[PDB]
Amino acid sequence: VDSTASRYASALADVADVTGTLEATNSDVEKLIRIFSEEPVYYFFANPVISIDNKRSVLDEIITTSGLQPHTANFINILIDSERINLVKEILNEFEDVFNKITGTEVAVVTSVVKLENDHLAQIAKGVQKITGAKNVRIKTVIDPSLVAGFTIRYGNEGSKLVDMSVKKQLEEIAAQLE
C-alpha cells in the first residue's frame, strides 16, 4: 500500500533505521498510540480551528512528560506543520507494519478456543518462518469460541494468507456430499 498515512510512517522508520534506534523509536511510537487514543487529546491536535502556535506549546509539554525520542518528537512536529495531523492514527498504525518489514519479523496470528502452550507455537512460529521466508516470526494469539478444537494461523504481507483446520473440515464435508 502507498497512501499518505503509509508514506509518512515509512519515513519515520527509515530515519530510525539509519540511526539504530529502531527498538528505541518503536517504543516511543507505541507510547504515542496510547496518547492519541483519547477522543479529547486527538481532537485538540486534529481540528483546524485551534491555533497552531498553541498546539506546539502543548505538544512540547506532552513530549517532555512522555520522554519521546529526538526524531519522534520532530516527526510529530513535522506532521503538525504540514497539516497531516488529521491522519495521525492511520500513520501510527502503518508504522508497525513497516517496522516488521525492516527487521524481517513477521506477525502471525493464531486462533483457538483453548489457550495453547509455547511448544505448539514454537513449531508454528518456526513453521510460518520457513513458509514465510522470514528472518524472525512474532506470534499473535486470540481466543475464539466459535471454531471447534483446531485453529487458523494468518500471515503474509497483510493478514491475507490463512491456513486453518477446525470448523473448515465440517464445512468441507458439507460441500463434499452435495457434489
Binding site: V1, G156, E158, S160, K161, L162, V163, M165
Partner: protein, 501 residues
C-alpha cells in the same frame, strides 16, 4: 425414483475417500462494496484476473491489484456482501467449467444452470478471456452455414467461421433471424450457442421454449442474462458464451454463437465503467468499447487443419436507433464483423418479413461460402434484384410500362415473394436452390402475388413426395446438375398442372 434406501450408502460415500488437504489459501477483508465493484484489503498473492470468492458465494474477478488493496469486479449483485467479511483467493484465473453436459441446458453468466434441472458436470475449464487464434492458426472460410432463410443463404451468404452482423432497429425480426439459423442446424454437427444479454426474461423464456418444442435444444446452450440482472453479469455473459463455444471449436466441432444484442453489452460496460468514474468518450461510451467487442468477436475463427478445422460462426445482433448506422456502437461492430445483415424497419412494417434489406447487406466471404448449386442458381437471383431496385425506381414516373420494363418489374415482385418466409420454418438447401430457380426463370410470372407463397409450398411438398431424386443430387453432388435441373422441371410441370385445378 427410489432415493431413500440408498442414501445410507450414498451419504457414507460422500464421507468416504475424502482427502481434506490443507494448503495455504489467500484471503482478504472487504473494505467497501459499491457500484458493482468491491475493494478488498489483503490478498497479497492474487493474480490479475483471478477469481476471488466472497463469503456469500458471490464470485468476483480481481482486476485492480493496487498497492494496498485489490479492486474486484463483483460478478453479481453485491447486495449481501457485507463490509468486513472475508474473501478467498481461489487460484483459478477467470474460468468457466465447460463440458459436453452443457448442451441443452439454459445457463447463467457464471455458467450455473438457471433452468432448474440440477447440476452440470464438467471435467475441464476454459478461461473466460483467452487469446484469439493467431494469424497462422486460421484458414479461409469455405464451408456454408445455411441459415434456412432464403435472402441470407442466396445473397448475403454466411460461411462457417465468419462473423456476420445482424443489425437493425428494435422489433425488426433480428431475434427471429438469429433463432431461425439455430433451428436450421439440426442435421449438421454444429453446436449453436445463444447468448441473451440484457433481454426480457419473458422473451428469453419463449426462445428457450421454442427450441425445446422444435427439438433444437439437443445442440444448443442458452447463456441467458436478462434485463434485471446486474451490469457486471451482462458485461461478462458473452465471454462466457464464447468460452463454451470454443470448447467445441478446438475439439473439431463447428459452432455458432449468437450474441443478442451486443448493444446491451456495450451499455452494461458503459454502466460499469461510468460507475467506476472512468473518463467517458463519445456517446459516454468509454475508450475500451471497441476493445470490448473486438476481444469477443476475434475469437470466432475458422481454424486451420493443423488445429482440426474447428470454427465459430458469430452472429452478433446490434440495435440501431432510427436506422442510424453511423452510431458509435454499430460503427464499431461493422468495422469488426466481416459483413452485416440489415433488417430495415420500413420493410418490416410493410409485411415483408424477413425484413432483409438486400441492397444494404454485405457478406465479405460471399460466395466461397455457397455450395455449387447455390452459386449457379443464385447468380441469376442476385442480378434480378439489382434490376428491380432500379425498375421500381421511376416506375410511376414513366408510368406506361412497356413490356421490357413491365415484365422485368412483374418478375421482380414475384422475386420478392420468394424471399418472404414464415418465422421459424427454415428451408433445406435443396428447397432454397429449387425455390430460387423457379422464380428466376419466370415460372411464377403467371401466378397472382397472393398465390406465389401458397404455390411454392405445394411444389416443395410435391418434390419431397414424388421426386426424391432431386434431393439426392443436390445433397451429394452439391452442384446444380443438368439431370437435376430437368428432374425439377417435370415436377414443376406436373405440380403446375395440379395447382390449376
Amino acid at each position: 425414483t427410489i432415493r431413500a434406501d440408498e442414501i445410507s450408502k450414498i451419504i457414507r460415500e460422500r464421507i468416504e475417500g475424502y482427502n481434506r488437504e490443507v494448503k495455504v489459501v489467500n484471503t482478504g477483508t472487504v473494505l467497501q462494496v459499491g457500484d458493482g465493484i468491491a475493494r478488498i484489503h489483503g490478498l497479497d498473492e492474487v493474480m490479475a484476473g483471478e477469481l476471488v470468492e466472497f463469503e456469500e458465494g458471490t464470485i468476483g474477478i480481481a482486476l485492480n491489484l493496487e498497492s494496498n488493496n485489490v479492486g474486484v469486479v463483483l460478478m453479481g449483485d453485491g447486495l449481501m456482501i457485507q463490509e468486513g467479511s472475508s474473501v478467498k483467493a481461489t487460484g483459478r484465473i477467470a474460468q468457466i467449467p465447460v463440458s459436453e453436459a452443457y448442451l441443452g441446458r439454459v445457463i447463467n453468466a457464471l455458467a450455473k444452470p438457471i433452468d432448474g434441472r440440477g447440476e452440470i458436470t464438467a471435467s475441464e475449464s476454459r478461461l473466460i478471456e483467452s487469446p484469439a487464434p493467431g494469424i497462422m492458426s486460421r484458414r479461409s472460410v469455405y464451408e456454408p452455414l445455411q441459415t434456412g432463410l432464403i435472402a441470407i443463404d442466396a445473397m448475403i451468404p454466411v460461411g462457417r467461421g465468419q462473423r456476420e452482423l445482424i443489425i437493425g432497429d428494435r422489433q425488426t425480426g433480428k431475434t427471429a433471424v438469429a433463432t431461425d439459423t439455430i433451428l436450421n442446424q439440426q442435421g449438421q454437427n454444429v453446436i449453436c450457442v445463444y447468448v441473451a444479454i440484457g433481454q426480457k426474461a419473458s422473451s428469453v423464456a419463449q426462445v428457450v421454449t421454442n427450441f425445446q418444442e422444435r427439438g433444437a435444444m439437443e445442440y444448443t446452450i442458452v447463456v441467458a442474462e436478462t434485463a434485471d440482472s446486474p451490469a457486471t453479469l451482462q458485461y461478462l455473459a458473452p465471454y462466457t458464451g464464447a468460452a463454451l463455444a470454443e470448447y467445441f471449436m478446438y475439439r473439431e466441432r463447428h459452432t455458432l454463437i449468437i450474441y443478442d444484442d451486443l448493444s446491451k453489452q456495450a451499455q452494461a460496460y458503459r454502466q460499469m465503467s461510468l460507475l467506476l468514474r472512468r473518463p467517458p468518450g463519445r456517446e459516454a461510451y468509454p475508450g475500451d468499447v471497441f476493445y470490448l467487442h473486438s476481444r469477443l468477436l476475434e475469437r470466432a475463427a475458422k481454424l486451420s487443419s493443423l488445429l482440426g478445422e474447428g470454427s465459430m460462426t458469430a452472429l452478433p445482433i446490434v440495435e440501431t436507433q432510427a436506422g442510424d448506422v453511423s452510431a458509435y456502437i454499430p460503427t464499431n461492430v461493422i468495422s469488426i464483423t466481416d459483413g452485416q445483415i440489415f433488417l430495415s424497419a420500413d420493410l418490416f412494417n410493410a409485411g415483408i418479413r424477413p425484413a432483409i434489406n438486400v441492397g444494404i447487406s454485405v457478406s465479405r466471404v460471399g460466395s466461397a461460402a455457397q455450395i455449387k448449386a447455390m452459386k449457379k442458381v443464385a447468380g441469376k437471383l442476385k442480378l434480378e434484384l439489382a434490376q428491380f431496385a432500379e425498375l421500381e425506381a421511376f416506375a410511376q414516373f414513366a408510368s406506361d410500362l412497356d413490356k421490357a420494363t413491365q415484365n422485368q418489374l412483374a418478375r421482380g415482385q414475384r422475386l420478392r415473394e420468394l424471399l418472404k418466409q414464415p418465422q421459424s420454418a427454415p428451408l433445406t438447401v435443396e428447397e432454397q436452390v429449387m425455390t430460387i430457380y423457379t422464380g428466376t426463370n419466370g415460372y411464377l410470372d403467371s401466378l397472382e402475388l397472393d398465390q406465389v407463397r401458397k404455390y411454392l409450398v405445394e411444389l416443395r411438398t410435391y418434390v419431397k413426395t414424388n421426386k426424391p431424386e432431386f434431393q439426392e443430387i443436390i445433397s451429394s453432388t452439391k452442384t446444380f446438375t443438368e439431370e437435376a435441373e430437368a428432374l425439377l422441371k417435370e415436377a414443376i410441370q406436373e405440380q403446375m398442372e395440379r395447382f390449376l385445378l
